[PDB]
Structure 1
Amino acid sequence: QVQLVQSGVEVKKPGASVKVSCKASGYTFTNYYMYWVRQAPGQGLEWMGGINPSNGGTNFNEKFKNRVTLTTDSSTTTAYMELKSLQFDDTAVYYCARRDYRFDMGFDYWGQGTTVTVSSASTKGPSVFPLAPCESTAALGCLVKDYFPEPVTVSWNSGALTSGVHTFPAVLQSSGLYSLSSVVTVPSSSLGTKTYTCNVDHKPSNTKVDKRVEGGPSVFLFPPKPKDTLMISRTPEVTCVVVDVSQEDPEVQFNWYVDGVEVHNAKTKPREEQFNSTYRVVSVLTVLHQDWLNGKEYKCKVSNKGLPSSIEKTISKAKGQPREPQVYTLPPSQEEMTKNQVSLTCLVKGFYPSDIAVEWESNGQPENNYKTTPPVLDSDGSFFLYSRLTVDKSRWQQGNVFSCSVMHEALHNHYTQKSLSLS
């Protein structure tokens, strides 16, 4: 439970002094040096000095040895840093950090930082100006100019508009006041229909302003094969295929999300040149059997230099109460017995969703001479299909048993079968 808690924001005038404190707890204060380090805006770390809390002995950086005083109050286990004659370039975050006195193993624990701003400015609320133009995407914004101190927060349409919003970090101007811009990109078609309002809040001056501001690659996302999601032995995969990738922009990029969370285990295949002077590129995300069956959404986001914005595509298993297939095998018509080959039928019906696998076998070996119809929607919301196996009439007359096997999530063990034979 080691803690280093520093004092809060400091806004000071040039020539004045600041004193930052660093409250220590959860360790023996005596066993560690307390160091001070500063970071100027957009700059690196700079060591200022260190104090020994047992004897009060100090070490300084020559740049700070004549303007900084380090003291420790062992009663309140607090370390202090007094910086005098403040200059404008003393604006920075000041950190206290501990170092083991006994053996040097780095700055193992740092305080949260204390922002010190050196400025001749006094509290001032911003002026809010619209940023509107004098193309499928339009840009609009708000110029929030001349405010002091930081920060200002900007929202759009009271938080309804969050996508495409960039609130820029503030710039300190020559005048000593801050200024920033907030922009939003929107479909040009909306400009007539929709309104855009920026909500500016500057808590230090209690100011609140609400200002009204007035052909390429294609992606196909494929689900897993139905047998794959139902058998733990097989591997189910979602497949993203991008076609019409220019010869000028081979830039192969995919991002994958499962219920909006990014995953990094997809495997991108090597780029394939097509007979129409374009590339074709596929990415394959392996999925968890139960994640596909629980209704998780798999999103594929494609990025390319030839795409003004990314192409997103989503795919999930169909929603609705899973319903179990009913399997009925129907023998060949007596009118078909005047032929060298006969048709064994398998009716699969009343199932939902439509993802199913149907096969045929005899004597524990696959019968591959069949065709299955695609599923067809019924008036009750469930699907049906027929599978037709072509057998030599000879095979059927000898009393050989044929089996129509069905695999569907709603079945127990995801599997059922119906046999068929000549009586």
Structure 2
Amino acid sequence: SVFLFPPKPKDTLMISRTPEVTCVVVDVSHEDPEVKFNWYVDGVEVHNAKTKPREEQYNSTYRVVSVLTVLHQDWLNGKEYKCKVSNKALPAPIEKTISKAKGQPREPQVYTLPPSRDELRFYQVSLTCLVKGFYPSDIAVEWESNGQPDIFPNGLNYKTTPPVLDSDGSFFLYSKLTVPYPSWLMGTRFSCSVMHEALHNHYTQKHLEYQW
């Protein structure tokens, strides 16, 4: 069986990062550990990929991974990436194809919402980031603060929901940042950072802070 994976959204949107398609091969036997990979971008073969050391599994199978570095603009422009796997236990090679989702890109709207009055009873309060109206669903969301590091030594404690298909064919998600009520009253500025293909510089940022 073959599994072909897309690049990480944040990798395709930042020039400094390295996006890559990942072609995983499973059900590899001990008698047949040979695996060959052929990569094709829009049908044209490319030879920049790199195979990884075969991973022995606890169920007596191997896991063979082949990575291909892609150009950010190639993936965003919708070029197809095809992985071709050859093995003796396979009558013929397996070809999987992956590409970015089709459809006109749509720009996310980012809204920050303070905690409810009813939540201030608790020591931990919830800072909310609403990201709606974007397409495709590939997106990256993070939180930041201008707080000094001992205030958040282990970083910020936030979770983000997966994209949800909205009633108009676009996607939305929420990201929840949990902070102590004192650091909220302290006036610290917290920032929801959203990275998406349709944004200017693939990046936008919305802030949230208390006012005494």
What interval of TM-score do these two structures reach, taking the shorter chain for normalisation? over 0.9
1:380-391 superposed matches below 5 A: 380-391=168-179
CA shift digits 1:1-52 (9 cap, x unpaired) = xxxxxxxxxxxxxxxxxxxxxxxxxxxxxxxxxxxxxxxxxxxxxxxxxxxx
Q: Distance between the aligned counterparts of 1:245 and 1:398, measured in 2?
A: 57
Q: Partners in 1 of 2:191 and 2:55 — Cα distance? A: 41
CA distance in 2 between counterparts of 1:359 and 1:270 reads 32
Tell me whether 1:261 sits opposite 2:49 in the alignment: no
Alignment of 1:98-113 (within 5 A): none
1:274-313 equivalences in 2 (<5 Å): 274-313=57-96
Question: Is 2:129 aligned against 1:341?
Answer: no
Q: Distance in 1 between matches of 2:105 and 2:182?
A: 40
Deviations 1:373-399 (A, max 9, x none): 000011211000000001011100111
- Partners of 1:252 and 1:271 within 8 A in 2: no
Aligned residue runs from structure 1 range 368-407, under 5 A: 368-407=156-195
| Equivalences for residues 402-413 of structure 1 within 5 A | 402-413=190-201
Paired amino acid for 2:54: R
Distance 2:27 2:199 in 1: 41
**Superposition map of 1:139-288 within 5 A:** 218-288=1-71
Question: Secondary structure of 2:11's match?
Answer: coil
State the Cα deviation string for residues 86-145 of structure 1 (Å, max 9, x = none).
xxxxxxxxxxxxxxxxxxxxxxxxxxxxxxxxxxxxxxxxxxxxxxxxxxxxxxxxxxxx
Candidates 105, 110, 131, aligned match of 1:327: 110
Deviations 1:306-333 (A, max 9, x none): 1111111110000000000000000000
Q: Does 1:352 align with 2:140?
A: no
* Distance in 2 of aligned mates of 1:339 and 1:400: 18
Q: How many residues get paired?
A: 206
Match of 2:206 in 1: 418
Task: Determine the C-alpha separation between the residues in 2 that align with 1:392 and 1:234.
Answer: 33
Q: Secondary structure at the match of 1:413?
A: helix
Amino acid at match of 2:182: S
Q: Letter of the 1:375 partner, please give it.
A: P
**SS of alignment partner, residue 192 of structure 2:** strand
CA–CA separation in structure 1 for the residues paired with 2:106 and 2:129: 18
Hey, what's the Cα distance between the residues in 2 that align with 1:385 and 1:376? 6
**TM-fit CA distance, 1:240:** 0.3
Which of 303-312 and 361-370 deviates more? 361-370
Q: Which secondary structure does the structure 2 equivalent of 1:305 belong to?
A: coil
Q: Could you tell me how far 1:258 is from its partner in structure 2?
A: 0.3
In structure 2, C-alpha distance between the alignment counterparts of 1:312 and 1:368, rounded to whole Å? 42
**Match of 1:335, SS?**
helix
Percent identity, aligned pairs only, is: 86
Question: Equivalents in 2 of 1:243, 1:315: separation in Å?
Answer: 18
Structure 1: 5+ residue stretches without partners: 1-217
* Structure-1 separation of matches of 2:58 and 2:210: 52
Equivalent pair of 1:347/1:387 in contact (CA under 8 Å)? yes
Structure 2 counterpart of 1:288, one-letter code: L
Query: So what's the TM-score if we normalise by structure 2?
Result: 0.95
CA distance in 1, matches of 2:67, 2:210: 46
Runs of 4+ in 1 over 4 A off after TM superposition: 364-367
CA RMSD of aligned residues (A): 1.2
Please identify which structure carries the higher strand content.
Answer: 1
Distance in 2 separating the partners of 1:326 and 1:271:
43
Deviation track 1:327-349 (CA, whole Å, cap 9, x = no partner) reads 00000000000111100000000
Deviation at 1:368, TM superposition (A): 3.1
Residues 228, 234 of structure 1: 8 Å contact kept: yes
Give the Cα–Cα distance (whole angstroms) in 1 for the partners of residues 166 and 146 of structure 2: 34
Supply the distance in 1 between the matched residues of 2:96 and 2:136 (Cα, whole angstroms): 21
SS of match in other structure, 1:228? helix
1:357/1:408 contact within 8 Å kept: yes
Provide the secondary structure at the position in 1 that maps to 2:13: coil
Code of the residue aligned with 1:231 in structure 2: it is M
Q: Distance in 2 between matches of 1:368 and 1:259?
A: 41
Output one character per residue of 1:205-231: Cα deviation in whole Å (capped at 9) or x when no partner. Answer: xxxxxxxxxxxxx11111011011110
Q: Which amino acid aligns with 2:204?
A: T
The secondary structure found in structure 2 opposite 1:358 is strand
Distance 2:54 2:108 in 1: 41
> Per-residue deviation at 1:270?
1.3
